[PDB]
Amino acid sequence: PESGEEYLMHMFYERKRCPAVVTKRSSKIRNNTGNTTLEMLDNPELPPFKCLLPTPEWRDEQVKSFQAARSQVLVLRKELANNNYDQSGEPPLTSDQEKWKEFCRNQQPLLSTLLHLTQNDLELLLEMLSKWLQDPNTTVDLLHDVWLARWLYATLVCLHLPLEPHVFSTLRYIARTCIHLRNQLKEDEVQRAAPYNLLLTLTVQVFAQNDFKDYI
Template sequence: MASDSDSSDCGLLNQALPTPTLSSNFRPVAAPTSAEEYIQHVVWEARQCKAVVTVDLEEHKLNKPIAVVQKQVKATAPKGFTPSLESQQNLMASFSKLRAHIATLRASGKIPRPPIVLPGIKKREEWCKLCFGNSFQLALLKQSSQDSMQPQLIEGQQPLLSILLNIKQKGIENLLEWHAQWLEVLGFSEAQGRWFYALLACLEKPLTPETCSQIRHIAMMCAKIRASLETADHPHLSQLNVIICIVARYFCQEDLVDH
């Protein structure tokens, strides 16, 4: 709104309500006591606004480099290293059947007792020993080139359903995260391949964003290891392909699918 006495509007605004000319004794700090005085206050405040407002930019902030996060790309497998579409479909059918069996056992409440006492869900070192025996410890000692006498090899536990069904989902998620860390440290092993398969079979949907990111990271690492294999006859290739296929197809990470 504007009054006839306001010459700064250049005729661009039409007057909405008639307003009297502001008197010389108009006090903008005084609270309006009527509708007419309220409109006079609005008109007065509008006149205090500049027609053009500028901002002084701080050039050093404009030139500050911005961090760019690049999306990870799955390592390309050598020719002949990826499974056929038929093999992947058969794997998905078998994996889905196993998950249905696990769901039936959970629903029945008749979960078998584990053959051993299970560690707490936060006991990473104890779970490492359970999964791998002391082979992980021996491998670390070998990496550090320690000349001290090494302990005798103790075998780890197989990923039995009687063990996995007695682990809560938070524990399953913890184990996946720890296995990913162990994979980065010592590389892939057949024992770990079996544990990855079993853990993915017991992982309930829908996934949390953190767990989804974790299994993607696992599949990406498996793809990187696969790309480094020298021959398609390598004993680890089939397990690596299984893990990549399950993450990509069953857990709907389409950009990781082997075509």
């Protein structure tokens, strides 16, 4: 009893007769699944000596100092945009990493330098810095290797927001490695553990990756 459109009206009415939600369990085979689990990133060292860790009053204080410099960079960036600074007018930067390592070691993260870098540059510089901790055959210290720490800070302030997700990832690696570095500290002085504590504070506090809370 259909013509063209008529079968559609035969169907809307056919599905109306139907229970819409049907549930049917066991019957054949079933049983509890053995499964394939999940390949997971291992949680760091919990750590030894919770005394090396910082005071909340300090953490909150160090975050003020960060957010303040961040807001002051924004001020300087707006003043640059008003003076029609075209970021695209910036020539091509090296990808050498070694040419870079020497630059950061020897030149400082002054705003004059840092403001000339695009979000993509900062993005890449951070990946570089990350790899510069993630076992250089160098016995890295941050307290000693100040230029690293100084740059890591700068780079972190500058990063334009929202941050891309792989920037969060390549930041969590920095979190992890200074968690690591710091765990190697005795009591090897509170001040020697100080940089890592800041770069963790930030990660948990500023970049709100709380699945670290308990390492800061």
